Amino acid sequence: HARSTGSYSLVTQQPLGGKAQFGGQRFGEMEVWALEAYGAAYTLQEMLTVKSDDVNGRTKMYKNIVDGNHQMEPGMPESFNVLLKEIRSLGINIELEDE
Amino acid sequence: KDLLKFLKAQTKTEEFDAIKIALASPDMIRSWSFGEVKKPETINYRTFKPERDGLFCARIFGPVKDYECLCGKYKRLKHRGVICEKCGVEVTQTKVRRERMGHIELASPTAHIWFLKSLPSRIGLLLDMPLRDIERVLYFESYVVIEGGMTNLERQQILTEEQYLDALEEFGDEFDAKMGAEAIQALLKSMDLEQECEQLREELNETNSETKRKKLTKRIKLLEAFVQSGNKPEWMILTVLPVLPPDLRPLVPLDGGRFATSDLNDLYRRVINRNNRLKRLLDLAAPDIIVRNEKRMLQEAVDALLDNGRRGRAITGSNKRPLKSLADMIKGKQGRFRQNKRVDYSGRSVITVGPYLRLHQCGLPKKMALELFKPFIYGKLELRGLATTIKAAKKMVE
Amino acid sequence: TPEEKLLRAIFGEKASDVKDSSLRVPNGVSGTVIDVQVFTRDGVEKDKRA
Amino acid sequence: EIGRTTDPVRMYMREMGTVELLTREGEIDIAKRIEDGINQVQCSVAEYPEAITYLLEQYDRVEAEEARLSDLITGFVDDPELAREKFAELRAQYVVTRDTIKATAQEEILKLSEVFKQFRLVPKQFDYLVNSMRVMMDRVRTQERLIMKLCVEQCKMPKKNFITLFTGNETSDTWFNAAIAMNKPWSEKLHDVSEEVHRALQKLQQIEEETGLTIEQVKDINRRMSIGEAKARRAKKEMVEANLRLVISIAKKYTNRGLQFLDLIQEGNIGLMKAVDKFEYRRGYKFSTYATWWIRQAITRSIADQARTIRIPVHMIETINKLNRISRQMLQEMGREPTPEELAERMLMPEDKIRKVLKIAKEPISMETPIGDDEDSHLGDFIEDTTLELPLDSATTESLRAATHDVLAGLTAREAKVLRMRFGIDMNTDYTLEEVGKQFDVTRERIRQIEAKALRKLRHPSRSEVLRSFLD
Amino acid sequence: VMTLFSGPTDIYSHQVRIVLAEKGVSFEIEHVEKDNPPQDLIDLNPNQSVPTLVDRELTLWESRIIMEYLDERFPHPPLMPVYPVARGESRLYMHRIEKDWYTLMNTIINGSASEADAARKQLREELLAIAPVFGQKPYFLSDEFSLVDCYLAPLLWRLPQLGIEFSGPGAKELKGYMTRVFERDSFLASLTEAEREMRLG
Amino acid sequence: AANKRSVMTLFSGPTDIYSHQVRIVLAEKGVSFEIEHVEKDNPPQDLIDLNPNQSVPTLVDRELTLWESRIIMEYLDERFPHPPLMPVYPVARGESRLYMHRIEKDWYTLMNTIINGSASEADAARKQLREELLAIAPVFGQKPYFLSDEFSLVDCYLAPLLWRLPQLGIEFSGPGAKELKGYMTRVFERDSFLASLTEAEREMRL
Numbered sequence A: 001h002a003r004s005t006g007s008y009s010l011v012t013q014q015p016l017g018g019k020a021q022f023g024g025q026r027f028g029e030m031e032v033w034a035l036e037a038y039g040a041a042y043t044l045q046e047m048l049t050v051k052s053d054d055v056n057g058r059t060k061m062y063k064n065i066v067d068g069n070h071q072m073e074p075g076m077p078e079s080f081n082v083l084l085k086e087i088r089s090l091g092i093n094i095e096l097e098d099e
Numbered sequence B: 001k002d003l004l005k006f007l008k009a010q011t012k013t014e015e016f017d018a019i020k021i022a023l024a025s026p027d028m029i030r031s032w033s034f035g036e037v038k039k040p041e042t043i044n045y046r047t048f049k050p051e052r053d054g055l056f057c058a059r060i061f062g063p064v065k066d067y068e069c070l071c072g073k074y075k076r077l078k079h080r081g082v083i084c085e086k087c088g089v090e091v092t093q094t095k096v097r098r099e100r101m102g103h104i105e106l107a108s109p110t111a112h113i114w115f116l117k118s119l120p121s122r123i124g125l126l127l128d129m130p131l132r133d134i135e136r137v138l139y140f141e142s143y144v145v146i147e148g149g150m151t152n153l154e155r156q157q158i159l160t161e162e163q164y165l166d167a168l169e170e171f172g173d174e175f176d177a178k179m180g181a182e183a184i185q186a187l188l189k190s191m192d193l194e195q196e197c198e199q200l201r202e203e204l205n206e207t208n209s210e211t212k213r214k215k216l217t218k219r220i221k222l223l224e225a226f227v228q229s230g231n232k233p234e235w236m237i238l239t240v241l242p243v244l245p246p247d248l249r250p251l252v253p254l255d256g257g258r259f260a261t262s263d264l265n266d267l268y269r270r271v272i273n274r275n276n277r278l279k280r281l282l283d284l285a286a287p288d289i290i291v292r293n294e295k296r297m298l299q300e301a302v303d304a305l306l307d308n309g310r311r312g313r314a315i316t317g318s319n320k321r322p323l324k325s326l327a328d329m330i331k332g333k334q335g336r337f338r339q340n341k342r343v344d345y346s347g348r349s350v351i352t353v354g355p356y357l358r359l360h361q362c363g364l365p366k367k368m369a370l371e372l373f374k375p376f377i378y379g380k381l382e383l384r385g386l387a388t389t390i391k392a393a394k395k396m397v398e
Numbered sequence C: 001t002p003e004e005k006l007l008r009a010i011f012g013e014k015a016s017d018v019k020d021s022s023l024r025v026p027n028g029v030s031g032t033v034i035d036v037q038v039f040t041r042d043g044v045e046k047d048k049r050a
Numbered sequence D: 001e002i003g004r005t006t007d008p009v010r011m012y013m014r015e016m017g018t019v020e021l022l023t024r025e026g027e028i029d030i031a032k033r034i035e036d037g038i039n040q041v042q043c044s045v046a047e048y049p050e051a052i053t054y055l056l057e058q059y060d061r062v063e064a065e066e067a068r069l070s071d072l073i074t075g076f077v078d079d080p081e082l083a084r085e086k087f088a089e090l091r092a093q094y095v096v097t098r099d100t101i102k103a104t105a106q107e108e109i110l111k112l113s114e115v116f117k118q119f120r121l122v123p124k125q126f127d128y129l130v131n132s133m134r135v136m137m138d139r140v141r142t143q144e145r146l147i148m149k150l151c152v153e154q155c156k157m158p159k160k161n162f163i164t165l166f167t168g169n170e171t172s173d174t175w176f177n178a179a180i181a182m183n184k185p186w187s188e189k190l191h192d193v194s195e196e197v198h199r200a201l202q203k204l205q206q207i208e209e210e211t212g213l214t215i216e217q218v219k220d221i222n223r224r225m226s227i228g229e230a231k232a233r234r235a236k237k238e239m240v241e242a243n244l245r246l247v248i249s250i251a252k253k254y255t256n257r258g259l260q261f262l263d264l265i266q267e268g269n270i271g272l273m274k275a276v277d278k279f280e281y282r283r284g285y286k287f288s289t290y291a292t293w294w295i296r297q298a299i300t301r302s303i304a305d306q307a308r309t310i311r312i313p314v315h316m317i318e319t320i321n322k323l324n325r326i327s328r329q330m331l332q333e334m335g336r337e338p339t340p341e342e343l344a345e346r347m348l349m350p351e352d353k354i355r356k357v358l359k360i361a362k363e364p365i366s367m368e369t370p371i372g373d374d375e376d377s378h379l380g381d382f383i384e385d386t387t388l389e390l391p392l393d394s395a396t397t398e399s400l401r402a403a404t405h406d407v408l409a410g411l412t413a414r415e416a417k418v419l420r421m422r423f424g425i426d427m428n429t430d431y432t433l434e435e436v437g438k439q440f441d442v443t444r445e446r447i448r449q450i451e452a453k454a455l456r457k458l459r460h461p462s463r464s465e466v467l468r469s470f471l472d
Numbered sequence E: 001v002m003t004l005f006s007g008p009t010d011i012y013s014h015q016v017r018i019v020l021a022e023k024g025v026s027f028e029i030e031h032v033e034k035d036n037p038p039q040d041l042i043d044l045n046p047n048q049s050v051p052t053l054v055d056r057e058l059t060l061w062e063s064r065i066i067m068e069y070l071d072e073r074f075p076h077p078p079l080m081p082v083y084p085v086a087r088g089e090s091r092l093y094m095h096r097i098e099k100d101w102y103t104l105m106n107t108i109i110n111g112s113a114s115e116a117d118a119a120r121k122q123l124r125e126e127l128l129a130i131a132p133v134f135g136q137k138p139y140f141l142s143d144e145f146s147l148v149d150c151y152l153a154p155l156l157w158r159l160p161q162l163g164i165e166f167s168g169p170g171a172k173e174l175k176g177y178m179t180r181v182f183e184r185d186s187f188l189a190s191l192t193e194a195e196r197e198m199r200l201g
Numbered sequence F: 001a002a003n004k005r006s007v008m009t010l011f012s013g014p015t016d017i018y019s020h021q022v023r024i025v026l027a028e029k030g031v032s033f034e035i036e037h038v039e040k041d042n043p044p045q046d047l048i049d050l051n052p053n054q055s056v057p058t059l060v061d062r063e064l065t066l067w068e069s070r071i072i073m074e075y076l077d078e079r080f081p082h083p084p085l086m087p088v089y090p091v092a093r094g095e096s097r098l099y100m101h102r103i104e105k106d107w108y109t110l111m112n113t114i115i116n117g118s119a120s121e122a123d124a125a126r127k128q129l130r131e132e133l134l135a136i137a138p139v140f141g142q143k144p145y146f147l148s149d150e151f152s153l154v155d156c157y158l159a160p161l162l163w164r165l166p167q168l169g170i171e172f173s174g175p176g177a178k179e180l181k182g183y184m185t186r187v188f189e190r191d192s193f194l195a196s197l198t199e200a201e202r203e204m205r206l
């Protein structure tokens, strides 16, 4: 298989295979410890912010790419904003500071 | 005037640090929500638009179609911020249906099953109460005293059903015995973390016992957290339970007629129904054998929502597997719910040998590389002029 | 949209009353169509191929 | 005895059956106790001369249509066919029963309603009479919580002294002189504050006129009535606790319909709590053969209300349950199976409603049902979402603004602004033709022309070679 | 969540209340002391000037913005013209009364008893200026009540406490106004216990 | 008479900013208007007869004059639509009617007080003015204008009161002027401003 852009899951906006275009590969937990071993930290940031999960941070990295401007504005993933709505729905009160 | 400098930054908390976490007071859980979900029903069954005030509302969690009211009276691009007077939908993007919250208003308090059954019972060791007695009060099986005064009763004597009844005939005032989950919200509410804070800063010194003065300093270290932190004690007894947004627990329609609900719409319907009845028995004025069985039955359904499984395991209906509550969604699959993630621009195939290559190059079949590098190829075919527009470069690569 | 709504008036592209959702062969495959079968709900007419 | 039991059904029975069953003659003993209970109430409103104040307007407007016979009467005890002979027999004593005090001051006002015992009321407006004098107590009672505080925390007096001379009466000028004359700092202090003690209790002086009787009788007009209700509250409870063992024997036939067991035997209680409400023993039939209807009435009205996720109405579950009661009776006879059309013959549906009643009852598949092989997967990992748009579908609309900002820029000045205002191009909402005529200061049917012939210019080729490229 | 830091007395706070209770907004008011709410509103209001609206994201301090926002966002019933010709009439007619009359009533209350007469009668002759015109429409230059009369209903209601009234003329075609607008539920269910003892209605 | 045509009538002021604030939006919509730089002591006749409140400016279009800094530049933005000057969402719209109220009541009094104030107030106001206008420095990095992509009316309330910067004796001072001073290179030379500027108000640019 091979996939450059396709469907996206429902609750968490990552990819999958259900639309004649299977999911991307599994960049599992074991394969992030092999990109922190090297110093590689720009490859790691795009591999879980633009290429997978951000919402309006990846419909720019597709319009930068088609113009020959390889450069990305990351934004915060959509699989962390669901982890704040799933904790506030308990008693707990998670937020973020300002600085 | 940093105010105008504030709002530029106030709506811009993308540069941050120090995720801060703490308890949530009922005056704040009432301040995330946009309305009070107050019925059990989800959609209309005939025209699948969602009902009003139900779980899947549109006056509460926003609209359904992007930039368009629900009835069908405000579609144009002229009105794009107004709220429809017929059905009070705010005409904005349907993305906002994904980050608003509701809230149910409980008709009687109920203990937070995390702070009541996590092994060191944070309700227990804040009161110095044996957990087997708190749990004998949250089922309405045994009275408990509050504000004894001048009689033969402490502040936390567990009067059984008779001993109180063999006690209230002698006094009517100076004495107050409650029962149930609305009692532990009275023990906490009047306890003070400073009188018994320093007063235990002396009681530990007198106590000479390697076991006593070892856990004695464990309690006083918990009292010493509920003060500087800024969390009152009585916020561990819920009074308004907030509801997740209606796109993180979808009701998407499958292909063919069936729907594929998440397992929370089977649990929220079970709290709003039982809570909705208990609002009624207090108006119909039933005896205290039923309503006293109601609260005991509600409180088993707010604690089957937080962490379902530390009880009778309220298995799903219409099926024979246990439902999946909120705290069974963050819990370990061996990897975190969030990131530690699938990934675009990938592939896979059967490796082979190719012993003519240099050390620093691998093969890559034409049929794959033409599919990962697609958005780059679109750059050339519109840069070298070989395609007028991008829609006419997608038909040259196909 | 507004921009494209000028693109229609310029050429007269008659808008679609019906959307196309036919069944096209999955990518990367090629083979003679050796057999076809048609099932119909009892109560709807059979077209000529049926 | 609390052997670490957890589930409530263990805890329900553990306290339910401590009570004892009731013999038949016991049940008649209780209803005969309630039946005196309300008579302590309704006969304790005849003591209220304003009892017909809400109804004197009804029969003074029933014919004139402000009160209907279905909200006040049901047929007297022991329309114009019935109303004009009983209410008409109160048009004589209506105002004539105060000729004494307009002494026998309380016989006639009693004799106005001393015969009221045979007047029949209806469940509609019985509440207001309890709702009327109820708030009169908070219009007289909690206000009285200021008199004490005015004397205890406001004048240093105790509170349990002046009440002997003033309370109950609630109107006289006792502490004007009674608690003033004690030669104390506070007794002399009463005149110092001797206005808000009597001006606060002025609106209650309306109350005694509000019912026309003094405050003493007003006290016994409602306080005696409170015992009548509470004479029955404890009365009804003894029956809801006695037959409470019955609902469990009725609510086990429905133990699997999507509802928990314990949400079932709690819906029957609200049923049974109504059966004993309207119970009537004079007809002889035992309590069980009447409480078995109102009980089972509820658990089949709740199941059609909170059993489904996508709720279907109550008038339709009768139709679904007929399609299975009848597609199951045609299954033995016919033997094979039932078609989609023989139901149309067997039942009497229009041959398509049976085809719309079949696309309803199916419940939702839970989004966590583990798909085949029980791998580390669920159903919720395979249902993609369609609200989003293809980033090529959003890279064209971003590209289209290139052309229509460039192609449309290769126009003239006055003939391109209106071309941009006649559509929503690069602006807010679009506009009407002569709606723009007030914009270019020349109102005429030229505005239908400048756009007209100009957009022909963009229609020609090589001004559309880049614009045409978007249409397939 | 839509709060309001209304004054219990001042005509400005009575202005906004007519707009809220007209449109049907589910609001909740937090009173001020006399015309001074707490010092706990300086954080969401550096001016500390009532009225002030707060609905989950917004802060607004003026009768202009607070009263027109509720019109441009809660559409019906509408309290303005439709075409741009007449808004400038209404949008400017309400600039007259908020400049001539309102600050005129300062000395009648905030000015000594000398100048109370200086404002009293010189304004009364204006009070019957548009008085004959009420034989044109029912309301103030409108056949259906609108934002322009929103500055009069809380203005007329403050007459007997202020002091100037109707006597002979000035009440013939004028008093029909207040007997027609003072009964609408909006101005009915907007009256407060403090603003009510300025008359017998 | 004055409104006898379908044309406007603007008894503008040659130095008073109400004219120069209006004329920007007045001419930014491409409309044929009439300029009459006139004085307070002696304006033209029509500016005093049909103008029963006698302010500056004063716009008159076939029905009546419209006198205000707000009622005017609102009447044009609601009747001559394109291009647009104010947003669509009523949430972020009336707040755009709030900065205009936090300028006419915040940075106007610092102009009149410097016109009729004592020797220290002229720098005291210039104290509360000059540093305060540096307290709003980082705004411009995010948005190319005053917290709004499009050129909107809230920007037009600044530039006429940023064109009189040194004309009443002001000059910047401190770190970060390159963010705001460079910003003035983005607004001070626009067609809406260039063709609209009154040459009388220009000579205090050298």
Ligand SMILES: [Zn+2]
Residues within 6 Å of the ligand: B069, B070, B071, B072, B073, B074, B084, B085, B086, B087, B088, B089
């Ligand atoms: Zn609607």
